[PDB]
Structure formats: structure tokens, C-alpha cells
Design a binder for this molecule. Structure first.
Ligand SMILES: *Cc1cc2c(cc1C)nc1c(=O)[nH]c(=O)nc-1n2C[C@H](O)[C@H](O)[C@H](O)COP(=O)(O)OP(=O)(O)OC[C@H]1O[C@@H](n2cnc3c(N)ncnc32)[C@H](O)[C@@H]1O
Ligand SMILES: *Cc1cc2c(cc1C)nc1c(=O)[nH]c(=O)nc-1n2C[C@H](O)[C@H](O)[C@H](O)COP(=O)(O)OP(=O)(O)OC[C@H]1O[C@@H](n2cnc3c(N)ncnc32)[C@H](O)[C@@H]1O
Lengths: 356, 356
């Protein structure tokens, strides 16, 4: 039995390791990732005064994986042909390979559509880009004063076909990961407060839809009250279209002053999935599955983490959860009786609570 | 300067210790508590198979306090005369005393109105009573099968006068502490599942109002979906009036089958506060204050924790937060310049998230 695991982070690594440990030699587990190394840092930076806390885990998939009985091949997936059970990918040398599988576990995540933001190239500061968070660190340090805009881009969620899960297990969100925006807004305030710059710095928070939609209206009004107290402005229904040197523009031509723009780019499906068997994916480019992580159309395709339709918000712990379930269910299929954990929707993002 | 601190738990102890450490000899800090000992266990029990995890902190206020420069007097407060700045209390020997204060910090919490529940005496199982949680442990162990009802009583929240705080800082809730209900329902399911009793045991969860009101409607529907998957019934708008041997009755005559009733009693104001200077307290029996924890009517009265109007939900960490703010603000008043922390509403209970 040959099992291909696509990607190299939360969803992929969890599924690979979990699967190999469960079935051992009953299957060949091979991982295909677009890069040799996978990095794991802290979600949000440590904006402290004169104190920079570096902390990253750097995994070499080529050495870390074989060490566990898992083969590794570096390559960029271009599409999956679910009908013939083939994965097409470009190898480092530029050559195009097409390999077949008995089972595939898709963990290549989603896509941060920075390309949908005019001026991102020249003026953007991303919170989700590796060392892009270093460029921000420096700018925030040398900042004399002015306007700061922090927020996220729209979530191009897919809707059809629908995952085969219980009702209300998948929320509809305008933003894929909004919690980090709240936390960062509070941090930026504390940082500038410690520098006696509250009067020189003006923070605006923007949301593609209603801010923190998992909360009740009162809880949302309460968050708005905190912002008001802290001197933070809130702009709802602002779908970013462009970033200029001193302002940001939405889809309707409206503007927000911003000398520094901190953006969580819009989320769209992974291009490789958009270019796969049309009926494997929904209209967003995500793979709808059942509670066992098995595609609703192809019984030998598993989707984990961000790549799966049901993971809303797009959380790393849901990635780990899904990666584990996919591996347990498959193990049972390969003749190794295993308990398959039950999937749960998150209900609410704990970062909504300021005491967190 | 004489500072009386009423009560002996989260709010009181935090304020006393914080105050004494900040002002030292600049003031006499005396604590008056209805008991000599204060116990601190874990919020929710550990219902494991064959594994009972005992873990409690037992504080002897008479020895622990003096050791920190804080005097201690055991007595049950009967009322506070804010006009004359007197605290009336009954001593253990039955005698009545009254001491004048320059400042008072009220940390006597609220009241669990079990008396409002007919049959509580003979058939109730409380989650908030010390060793009452031991009586439940045994019953749940010897349970052969049947119906279990778990939920909370209504919250008799006060509304006027209103705390002097920013808009939306105080939510209106039908339940004072509902999160523990969700967690316990999930635990009970896991416990009976491990005993292969899911078919023999039927759990119903009841709410005085909506069910986790800090969440959006979808998030609430999602929690309802989880219950449906787990075979747990949910009954909204059920304000408990009576407990019989095999069922519970609400205020409208409706019933829920229950051979075991696990209830978080209704919350009402502390009787001693209901019997105090009428204009010190709101219509619920709680003390409305500003963000510094100072009463809106008497500038030398502080309210912390559950006793304060703004603490909704009624959380121990909000008690600690308020206890600390009251102490810092007072210290400044006593000539010891101190930073006064900013109070924040909780926004959402993290227990709403099943992955928590
Ligand atoms: C951006 C962010 C995310 C976040 C967060 C804060 C920020 C700023 N805070 C979080 C938190 O507090 N708690 C939590 O649980 N999650 C939090 N998140 C989200 C987390 O980053 C994501 O949910 C998580 O990373 C999802 O993991 P998944 O494993 O599903 O996906 P991924 O990390 O994007 O990894 C993708 C892997 O696939 C490889 N890849 C991508 N495309 C290809 C192609 N074409 N071919 C081959 N491999 C591919 C990537 O290289 C990567 O290895
Ligand atoms: C019941 C409960 C509470 C709870 C929880 C789960 C359960 C089942 N889980 C929590 C959680 O996960 N996180 C959290 O932060 N809080 C949680 N809670 C709530 C917590 O129990 C309360 O919010 C907290 O106890 C509030 O503390 P506070 O100090 O404000 O009040 P208190 O603990 O009731 O203490 C009252 C003290 O005052 C004395 N007292 C009472 N009446 C008198 C009179 N008349 N005279 C003198 N002293 C009096 C009491 O003896 C006690 O010392």
C-alpha cells in the first residue's frame, strides 16, 4: 500500500507520523512538500521594548522523516487527478513527475492571496509571512508617529458542494483567521503606550465583514467599547483592494489612513487544488469531506487542515485534529483496528477574550 | 487609616495582600470573614475511572493573615452602614459587633439561592458546594442507569443604579456561570461512555435562558449540534422551580426527567448587602462602582469580585482583577503612588470552546 502525504506542516506531519506509527510496515508513507525545510515559530510576535525573543523550530524533512520510516520527496504539487489517482508535481531540477497512490492525504493548506491586493508588493506588511514579521518589527521600532491600519482580507470560502458533516459544524466567515487581529491591536497599543506615543500614533482596525463574528452582538459591542476606550477606530465591511503609501482602499473606493498597514492577506484555496479534478473540490478550492476526513467524492482521498473545507476558522489545532483523524481512519482501513477521534467545531476563538 | 476587608477568597485576599504590600504601615488592614478557613479546590471535579485526584488548598486566615501584617476577625457581616461607615457583624460566640472604617473593601461575594428551589434539600446535587461534590461523586459511581439533568438556575442580576463604566462593559445574563455546565455535560458523557452505559444513561442539559449567550447564533446552533451528536438533550428557557425524585419542574409547569439533578443554584445578591444602606446597592443586591472599584455613591467603599455589579459572568479571575485594582487605587489615595490597572470585560468564556 502506497500512501502519499502532501505538504509539510501541521496537517501533513501529523497525518504522516500518526499513520506510520499506527500501521508500520503495512504501508509505504511518502511525503511530498514544496520545500526541504518546515519552520515553526510563534503565531504572534513579541513586540517588547529592547527585548527580541527569537524562537523557531526548523525541521529538515529529508532527515527528520526517514528517521521515522517515512520517505520524503521535495516537489511542488501542480494538480491531483482523483480519477486516475495520480499526483502531478514539479521536482527541484525542474522536471515534471506524475506519481500514483493507493491513498492520498492532502495537507497543502490554503493560499494567502496577496496578489489580490494592489500595492502589496511595495507597501504591505504581512503578519503571516515568515521573516516578513521582521520587516514590521524594524518599521514599528523606528516609527516616529502617524496612522496604522491593522486587519484582514476577505475569506473566499467555498460553498458547494457541502461537507458531509452535522448541521452547523462549519461556520460561514468573512475572515479565515481574525483573532490574531484583535490580539495584535491590543499589543500595538501597549507597545506605543510604553513609549509615550499614544498621542502620536493612531490605530484603525478593519474587518472584511462584521468583526469577530463568532460572538454575540453584545460581546461584539463590548469589544467595540474597549477599542473606544483605547482610542482605536473600527471599520467594518471594509474589503481591502489596494495599499498606498499613506492609506488603504476598499472595493467600494472608501479609504482608511495608514502609514503602516498590517494585513492578514485574503484566504483563497490552494491553486493546485483549484487545478485538480473539478469534483474533488468546492467552489473555493477546498476539499469537502465527511467527519473521517475522506473526500465526499473519492474514497481514497483525505483532506486535512487548511485544505479541508470544514476548517473554519483556519486553525493549526484543527489541522492537528484532522491530521490525526485521517491517519486513524486510514489505519483501520489497512487492517489495524484503531479508534477514530470525533471532530468538533471550535465554537469560539479564545483570543476573543482579552484576559487570554 | 483603618481599612476593613470583608470576605476571605479571591476578591478579599487579593485586595488585602495587595493593599498591605503596597502601603505597609501607612494603614491598618483587617479582614472580617464568616469562617476561619478558606478552601480552594478545582472548579470542576475529576470524574475518572478508578482514579480520584484530591487537590485542595486550605488557608487558616487567623495564621496566614497576621503573618503578612493583616489582622483577622471571624464574624458574619449582617449589614454595612455606608452613611456612618460602620460594619455590623455577628461574632462566633453570638455577640454583635460594629466597627468603624475609613475605607471598606467588600469581597463577600454573592449568594447561591438554593432556598428558591423546592426539594433542593432532599434531592439536590450542587456543583458549587464544597464536599457536596463528594455526594455526587458517589452517586455517579453507583448509578445503574436512568436520567440525568444538568444545568443552572436563573441569575437575579441587578440593573439600577448602573455601574459608571463604558457602554457594553456589563452584559445582561440569564445565568451567572454557565460555562461549567457545558464542560460537565461533556465530562459526564465521556465517563458513561467509558463504562459502556450510553444506552442506559440519558443526559438533559437545561438553561434558564438561551444557552451560552455570549456566543453568536451559529455558534450556539453548533453547540446544539454537538449535543445532538452525543445524544444530549438541550432545553432552553427552563427556570427551575422544583426538584422531585425523578424530575425537575420549571416556572411554567414544564418538566424534565431526572433521577440525578446536577444544579448550579440561582445567583442572588448577598443578603448582608441587601440589608445595607439602600443606595449602596442595586436592585439585585450587588454594589455598582466605577472602573476603580469605588462605589458610585460612597467614595470610601470598594466592591470586588462577585459582590460587584460589573462582574458578569461571575468569575474568580475577574475577582482577582477587581481585588487588585481596588488595592492599587486605594494605595494611591493613601499617598503611595501606584499604577491602577485597567478593567476589561471578559467578552467570551473560554469553556465555550470544546478544545479547551
Ligand atoms: C497566519 C496565522 C495563523 C494562525 C495564527 C496566527 C497567524 C498570524 N494563530 C493561530 C493560533 O493561535 N492557533 C492555531 O491553532 N492556529 C493558528 N493559526 C493558523 C495556522 O497557521 C494554520 O491553521 C495552520 O498552519 C494550518 O496548517 P496546514 O498544515 O493545514 O497548512 P499550512 O501550515 O499552510 O502548511 C501548508 C504546507 O503545504 C505545503 N504546500 C503548499 N502548497 C504546496 C504545493 N503546491 N505542493 C507541495 N507542498 C505544498 C507548504 O509548504 C506547507 O508545508
Ligand atoms: C461555582 C463555580 C464557580 C466558578 C467555576 C466553576 C464553578 C462550578 N469556574 C470558574 C473558572 O473556570 N474560572 C474563573 O475565573 N471562575 C470560576 N468560577 C467562579 C468563582 O468561583 C467566583 O467567580 C469567585 O469565587 C468569586 O470570588 P469572590 O471572592 O468574589 O467571592 P466568593 O468566592 O464567594 O467568596 C466569598 C467570601 O466572602 C465570605 N462571606 C460571604 N458572606 C459573608 C458574610 N455575611 N460575612 C462575612 N464573610 C462573608 C465567604 O465566606 C467567602 O470567604
Amino acid at each position: 500500500t502506497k500512501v502519499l502525504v502532501l505538504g509539510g506542516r501541521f496537517g501533513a506531519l501529523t497525518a504522516a507520523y500518526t499513520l506510520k506509527r499506527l500501521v508500520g510496515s503495512k504501508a509505504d508513507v511518502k511525503v511530498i512538500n514544496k520545500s526541504r525545510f518546515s519552520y515553526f515559530r510563534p503565531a504572534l510576535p513579541h513586540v517588547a521594548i529592547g527585548v527580541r525573543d527569537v524562537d523557531e523550530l526548523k525541521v529538515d524533512l529529508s532527515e527528520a522523516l526517514p528517521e521515522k520510516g517515512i520517505q520524503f520527496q521535495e516537489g511542488t504539487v501542480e494538480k491531483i487527478d482523483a480519477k486516475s489517482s495520480m499526483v502531478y508535481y514539479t521536482k527541484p531540477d525542474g522536471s515534471m513527475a506524475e506519481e500514483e497512490y493507493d491513498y492520498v492525504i492532502v495537507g497543502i493548506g490554503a493560499h494567502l492571496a496577496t496578489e489580490l491586493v494592489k500595492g502589496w508588493d511595495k507597501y504591505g506588511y504581512s503578519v503571516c509571512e515568515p521573516e516578513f514579521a521582521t520587516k514590521l518589527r524594524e518599521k514599528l521600532e523606528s516609527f516616529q508617529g502617524g496612522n496604522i491600519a491593522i486587519g484582514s482580507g476577505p475569506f473566499y470560502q467555498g460553498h458547494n458542494p457541502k461537507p458531509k458533516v452535522p448541521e452547523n459544524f462549519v461556520p460561514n466567515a468573512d475572515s479565515a483567521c481574525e483573532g490574531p487581529v484583535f490580539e495584535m491591536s491590543l499589543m500595538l497599543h501597549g507597545y506605543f503606550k510604553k513609549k509615550g506615543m499614544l498621542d502620536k500614533v493612531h490605530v484603525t482596525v478593519f474587518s472584511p465583514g462584521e468583526y469577530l463574528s463568532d460572538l454575540s452582538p453584545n460581546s461584539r459591542k463590548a469589544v467595540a467599547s474597549i477599542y473606544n476606550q483605547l482610542g482605536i477606530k473600527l471599520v467594518h465591511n471594509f474589503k481591502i483592494k489596494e495599499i498606498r503609501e499613506h492609506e488603504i482602499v476598499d472595493e467600494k473606493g472608501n479609504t482608511i489612513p495608514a502609514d503602516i498597514t498590517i494585513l492578514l492577506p485574503p484566504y483563497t484555496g490552494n491553486p493546485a487544488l483549484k487545478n485538480s479534478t473539478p469534483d474533488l473540490v468546492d467552489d473555493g478550492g477546498f476539499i469537502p469531506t465527511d467527519l473521517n476526513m475522506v473526500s465526499i467524492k473519492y474514497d481514497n482521498v483525505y483532506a486535512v487542515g487548511d485544505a479541508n473545507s470544514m476548517t473554519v476558522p483556519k486553525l493549526g489545532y484543527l489541522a492537528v485534529m484532522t491530521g490525526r483523524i485521517a491517519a486513524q481512519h486510514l489505519a483501520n482501513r489497512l487492517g489495524v483496528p484503531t479508534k477514530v477521534d470525533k471532530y468538533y467545531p471550535t465554537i469560539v476563538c479564545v483570543a476573543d477574550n482579552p484576559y487570554e
